[PDB]
Amino acid sequence: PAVGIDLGTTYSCVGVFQHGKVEIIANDQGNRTTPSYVAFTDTERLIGDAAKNQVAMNPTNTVFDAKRLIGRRFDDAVVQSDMKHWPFMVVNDAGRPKVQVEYKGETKSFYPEEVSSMVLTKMKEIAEAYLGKTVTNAVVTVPAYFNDSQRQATKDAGTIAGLNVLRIINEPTAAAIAYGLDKKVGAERNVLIFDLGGGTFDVSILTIEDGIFEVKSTAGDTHLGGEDFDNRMVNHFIAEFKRKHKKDISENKRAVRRLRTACERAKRTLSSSTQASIEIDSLYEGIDFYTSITRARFEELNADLFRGTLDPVEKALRDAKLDKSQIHDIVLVGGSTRIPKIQKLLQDFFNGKELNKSINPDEAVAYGAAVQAAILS
Amino acid sequence: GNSPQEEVELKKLKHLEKSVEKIADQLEELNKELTGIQQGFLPKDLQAEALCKLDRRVKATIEQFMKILEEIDTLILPENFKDSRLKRKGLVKKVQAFLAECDTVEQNICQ
Numbered sequence: 001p002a003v004g005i006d007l008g009t010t011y012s013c014v015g016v017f018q019h020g021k022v023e024i025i026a027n028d029q030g031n032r033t034t035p036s037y038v039a040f041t042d043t044e045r046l047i048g049d050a051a052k053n054q055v056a057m058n059p060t061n062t063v064f065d066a067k068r069l070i071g072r073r074f075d076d077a078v079v080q081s082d083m084k085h086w087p088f089m090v091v092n093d094a095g096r097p098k099v100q101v102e103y104k105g106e107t108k109s110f111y112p113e114e115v116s117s118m119v120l121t122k123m124k125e126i127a128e129a130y131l132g133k134t135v136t137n138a139v140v141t142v143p144a145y146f147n148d149s150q151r152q153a154t155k156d157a158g159t160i161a162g163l164n165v166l167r168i169i170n171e172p173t174a175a176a177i178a179y180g181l182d183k184k185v186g187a188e189r190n191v192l193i194f195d196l197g198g199g200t201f202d203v204s205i206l207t208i209e210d211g212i213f214e215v216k217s218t219a220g221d222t223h224l225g226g227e228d229f230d231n232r233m234v235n236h237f238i239a240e241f242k243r244k245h246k247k248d249i250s251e252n253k254r255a256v257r258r259l260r261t262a263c264e265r266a267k268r269t270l271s272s273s274t275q276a277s278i279e280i281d282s283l284y285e286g287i288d289f290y291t292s293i294t295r296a297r298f299e300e301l302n303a304d305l306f307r308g309t310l311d312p313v314e315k316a317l318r319d320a321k322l323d324k325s326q327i328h329d330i331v332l333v334g335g336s337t338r339i340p341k342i343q344k345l346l347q348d349f350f351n352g353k354e355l356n357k358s359i360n361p362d363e364a365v366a367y368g369a370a371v372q373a374a375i376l377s
Numbered sequence: 378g379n380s381p382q383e384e385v386e387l388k389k390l391k392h393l394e395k396s397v398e399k400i401a402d403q404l405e406e407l408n409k410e411l412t413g414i415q416q417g418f419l420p421k422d423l424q425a426e427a428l429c430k431l432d433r434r435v436k437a438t439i440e441q442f443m444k445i446l447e448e449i450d451t452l453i454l455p456e457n458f459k460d461s462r463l464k465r466k467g468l469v470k471k472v473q474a475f476l477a478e479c480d481t482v483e484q485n486i487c488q
């Protein structure tokens with residue numbers, strides 16, 4: 001048995017091709033994705049949902065985003081700038097980055113690949129707990145822009161996790177494989193993979209010919225996701241509460257959190273309905289906050305940000321030497337691609353082209369890896 | 378008047394009420410232990426160590442109440458659901474007073 005693993009910055013996902021079908025595997029908590037989180041406490045090391053659930057009670061000792069550090073030198077421009085987003089500590093050690101935490105009575109540091117191998121072990125175990133057997137063979141995906149140090153430190157994280165990494169496959173390629181785009185009949189195809197999650201935006205254009213893949217270009221934004229769209233709704237409702245109540249809630253951390261949590265949930269509702277209602281009792285100084293938001297108003301809050309997704313897309317096309325007509329396939333990956341306006345902006349830039357989007361966008365990459373892992377096994 | 382539908386909501390909030398009661402007893406256990414440690418039985422370096430342990434548990438407790446609040450905040454209760462709305466409001470206000478109780482504790486120890 002061979003599994004496909006999406007090792008994402010924020011979430012990981014494991015699939016197995018069995019009985020002629022891809023089964024995306026749920027963890028012990030019943031979730032088909034697992035947080036790429038490792039937490040160090042007084043008494044235990046937590047991985048996944050257990051680690052992300054205690055992030056508020058242990059911010060400096062909960063490690064996430066290791067995929068941003070993996071394979072990089074400490075003085076990497078990326079490493080220094082991302083580090084401003086993290087409440088945990090990152091350290092230099094002989095030119096390479098290390099995360100630093102109190103694992104209880106000591107004070108320990110880990111290479112990003114050691115943290116990535118903890119996450120892979122958890123994924124390995126998720127698969128073993130569902131299958132009821134040992135899992136050692138795996139495809140593990142990486143971003144198309146990953147360098148040699150980055151693909152290798154990822155492969156070593158796997159190895160350490162006790163996995164036999166059959167291949168390291170690009171995420172956009174894996175998504176293409178999920179939609180059987182490599183199975184197509186004759187002439188060479190140009191595929192645009194549009195990948196937008198909670199945290200990163202990646203555009204990739206590939207060539208496929210006779211099932212053989214070639215990366216043509218990459219583009220996007222390292223810090224763009226649904227996190228940003230929630231914030232536009234948050235600021236909208238903070239202004240509203242100030243308007244109706246003459247009250248500023250933004251320095252009540254617990255109120256801002258209640259509101260934000262309710263806002264990302266309203267956001268998801270708005271991907272399938274045209275209005276979302278929120279009732280929060282006693283949000284601030286005992287005042288109840290009942291409100292609703294339409295989809296059109298949500299789209300309006302985020303108008304620039306949505307429209308801005310098309311810029312990476314045009315950069316990609318430029319860099320691949322392609323016209324937008326010469327794209328034969330568009331594939332949707334990442335939870336944010338479920339937003340109707342994003343799918344419509346993309347739909348129309350490619351003059352009505354039709355999008356590949358039937359596979360759960362959070363799961364497509366592990367889905368393609370699982371297909372390829374079975375083929376390689 | 379009283380709808381079959383509102384029994385679904387009232388059942389949800391009853392289960393949330395019991396969860397609150399269980400966190401509230403963890404909170405109770407925090408003051409009962411705090412007191413014993415806040416009386417110089419052991420040296421100051423190690424008393425501090427006990428207070429920090431206690432502090433991490435206050436943090437767990439606060440976080441549990443917060444997750445309760447987030448669950449309640451998924452509820453949409455019709456204006457006619459007067460019983461649900463009154464029980465939701467009582468529960469929120471109660472949790473919030475427990476949260477104020479937790480803030481009293483942690484701002485006092487392991488600083």
Ligand SMILES: N#Cc1ccc(COC[C@H]2O[C@@H](n3c(NCc4ccc5ncccc5c4)nc4c(N)ncnc43)[C@H](O)[C@@H]2O)cc1
Pocket residue numbers: 011031033197198199225226227264267268269270271334335336337338339362
């Ligand atoms: N459990 C769980 C879980 C699973 C996957 C994710 C990844 O999602 C990444 C981003 O995708 C966004 N997103 C997602 N994410 C998938 C998802 C599914 C169930 C969830 N349940 C609780 C909380 C978040 C959830 C997200 N769905 C969206 C939608 N329908 N419309 C607009 N945006 C959506 C999320 O808000 C994130 O910002 C996040 C949480």
